[PDB]
Amino acid sequence: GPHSLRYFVTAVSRPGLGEPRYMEVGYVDDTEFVRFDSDAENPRYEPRARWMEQEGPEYWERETQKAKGNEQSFRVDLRTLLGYYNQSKGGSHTIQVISGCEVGSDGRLLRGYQQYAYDGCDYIALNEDLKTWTAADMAALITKHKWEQAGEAERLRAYLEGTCVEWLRRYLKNGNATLLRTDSPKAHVTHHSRPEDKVTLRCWALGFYPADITLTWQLNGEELIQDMELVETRPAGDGTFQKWASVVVPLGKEQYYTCHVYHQGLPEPLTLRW
């Protein structure tokens, strides 16, 4: 299937407490593979997945130098935005960026993107065309104009279509045993009493990879999506994922409800019941 290479950047000012906190976290698909954190003893880019042991020392040295430069550019940004928004130097503020590319199963580019937020709200974003920007407010309009005069979109586009794609392909090759595997979900159902002769049935899916999955409950051959409660799919600490979905049913009628689990590692979807 398709794959993605993403970099999540966060810079957070802390007036009275020194320099902003700066972090970069890189992902291939939904697996963390590299990270930089300014609050580390000796901040450096580090591997977060075993397969990254395949890069030599020069890789780490370059990524580290880049991160240090980025840290300084975001420090400048935090100051600049105080000016654009006419805010005080006493408050903490946050800049976030997500940059990435996605390829299909054949390795060809599907899409690229870069989006910025300030204090949790959209700031500026590269358009789907990889040629122009869209600005959320008049501050971002200042940025758009700067970036247009400097030709930044062209350089970013070259990164997104080029470098980003080539390195993603390389990671998929190097980390194939991890990234291209399939771990099938194991499922089970738990049962919990409630007042008013009702019961909560919870369908668990455990130990799966990749993260995409669908869990539904059915009655009378219909999905009950409207009445379910669930959690967002979540990492389980070892590179696999888990999820649950529950429904509340009448007591004594549990046998009429079935949980269904659909996943890449399930040629036929699982069907379970309490």
Binding site: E24, Y45, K66, N70, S73, T80, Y84, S99, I142
Partner: peptide, 9 residues
């Protein structure tokens, strides 16, 4: 391989 050179806002 990370973006380098995030242009200033």
């Amino acid at each position: 391989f990370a973006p380098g050179n995030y242009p200033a806002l």
